[PDB]
Design an enzyme around this catalytic site. Structure first.
Site: not given
Ligand SMILES: [Cl-]
Ligand SMILES: [Cl-]
Ligand SMILES: [Cl-]
Ligand SMILES: [Cl-]
Ligand SMILES: [Cl-]
Ligand SMILES: [Cl-]
Ligand SMILES: [Cl-]
Lengths: 227, 213, 213
Positions: C45, C49, C133
């Protein structure tokens, strides 16, 4: 209400300007007294002790019925002080705070209806958040300086760290459970600008006329955050 | 629709503890309700964990007519209707879904939705709600969190649920804006499944004596 | 657009741990992807960012066409589209934004959004999403919070991320509704930047053996 010469674009630019002005003040001050007052008149001696001991800032909570009159009194007694209003739950309260002379409002949680109201009346709002979804809601409305509340009960520094990681643009003002023993841990986090605290202006000291103690606690924190 | 929240608030304040029930066989609600009521705790929140919850509410209302009966885990208006038709007088949701709240307003049953932070409290207040479930209570920060919510929001009244036990309930009840706490321990499915009626009776008497000395 | 969630859930369930990668130099993804795959964890993943994320996704997809690749930190539809075009299998967001979820539907890419309380879970469920998540996992209350959420919401499947380590992952994976956890320790910036490929390989072998004995 429309002001001659002011279109929507000017209102937006004004709100951006006010956000920047508040951000810079918070970043310098690092600690904001959060004041809950019973008697509006008590704001005068309290403002005087804060100012003369080097902390020219006050956030007066609307949780007290005396709040609006207190803002009006303090504004007059302490023209140079940063004055905010807290516990702002709606636009009517926001407006009352603005009229009285506050230059920012804070809310415990995030309500887009309160934010839109503040963006329209032209008073900066620093709204409370405590999780990623609320941060995303605030970012989408063009806010970046947010209150993190309640700070300790929501997970403290580990939550702050987890929370700022994904969101590089945010700056936080943690409030709730902040004391001289943990404030430096929060301020060590680069995206934390300032923390809100009640201990140096605690209602127990105010109601019992303990002005010398308030002065001592104020001097101590002023030196601690900007040594 | 005229809200019964003033009645519900008063009943909760008196009870202080609400059994949160997860039933497997609906028939089991009859002996369970008998034990709860005769040991001083005439209340039950029956969770919608399976179709059997609806029948359980209907059987309990028939068997214990004056019992305070709510339905829990209500995620939509269809379930709220099922609960209303079965005889529940309020519904509870683990979180806050304004679509569910609107549906409950339309079908005419009171809802006590779950919240666990200031933003969700403000969302509820904006829809005219003041009695809210605080869930999950321990995992969300416990009494420290409760104090942080009731502090800014003088109008709210809370029902903390999640991780409440006899060892920590007093701390929650000591907060004036807490009406009652939800608890599963005295009606744990294991006890019901095993027909431990004497132990359920003991746990019920013990908590009633503890909170209402 | 037909959703690949079925396949995604199966892959997550098999892997049990998903490397969460914040990459400084896009080119680092090639050796990193190789080391991860050759040591039993063919998944990544890659967080937006990092500025390098889009190029890293493209490079990894070319180098490892069979890798499960998620794009993380997806905050709007523009990013989601960039992730799809780069070659990601799905997108992940730290919180839940209905606008992002709607954009993903339009674009045709699956999203696993982030949640940390019951109200956000209900918001996700109402949009038809069930794989979520759970973030930030430790700071939000950890396994006690996970247990609180999966209880009332039987349909959800979770990917806890935030504070997960080899010392606590088993406790999460023991919860049936947890599919996999996200972890950064085996792909830590320090290790990747300093090219500690043997240490990354060891940590990867160790966790794979731990969760899939
Ligand atoms: Cl995330
Ligand atoms: Cl506030
Ligand atoms: Cl706190
Ligand atoms: Cl519930
Ligand atoms: Cl809990
Ligand atoms: Cl929320
Ligand atoms: Cl965490």
């Amino acid at each position: 209400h429309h002001s001659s010469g002011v279109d929507l674009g000017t209102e937006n630019l004004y709100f951006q300007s006010m956000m920047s002005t508040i951000n810079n003040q918070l970043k310098a001050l690092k600690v904001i007294p959060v004041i809950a007052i019973d008697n509006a008149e008590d704001i005068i001696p309290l403002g005087k002790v804060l100012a003369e001991n080097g902390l020219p800032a006050a956030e007066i909570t609307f949780r007290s019925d005396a709040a609006v009159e207190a803002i009006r009194l303090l504004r007059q007694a302490q023209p140079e002080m940063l004055i905010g209003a807290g516990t702002i739950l709606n636009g009517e309260q926001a407006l009352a705070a603005k009229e009285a002379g506050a230059t920012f409002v804070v809310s415990p949680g995030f309500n887009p209806n309160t934010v839109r109201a503040c963006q329209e009346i032209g008073i900066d709002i620093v709204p409370g958040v405590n999780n990623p979804s609320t941060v995303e809601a605030a970012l989408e409305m063009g806010l970046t300086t947010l209150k993190f509340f309640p700070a300790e009960a929501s997970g403290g520094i580990s939550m702050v760290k987890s929370l700022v990681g994904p969101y590089g643009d945010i700056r936080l003002m943690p409030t709730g459970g902040i004391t001289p023993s943990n404030i430096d841990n929060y301020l060590a986090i680069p995206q934390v600008l300032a923390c809100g605290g009640t201990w140096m202006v605690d209602k127990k000291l105010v109601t019992n006329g303990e002005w010398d103690e308030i002065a001592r606690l104020t001097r101590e924190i002023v030196e601690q955050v900007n040594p």
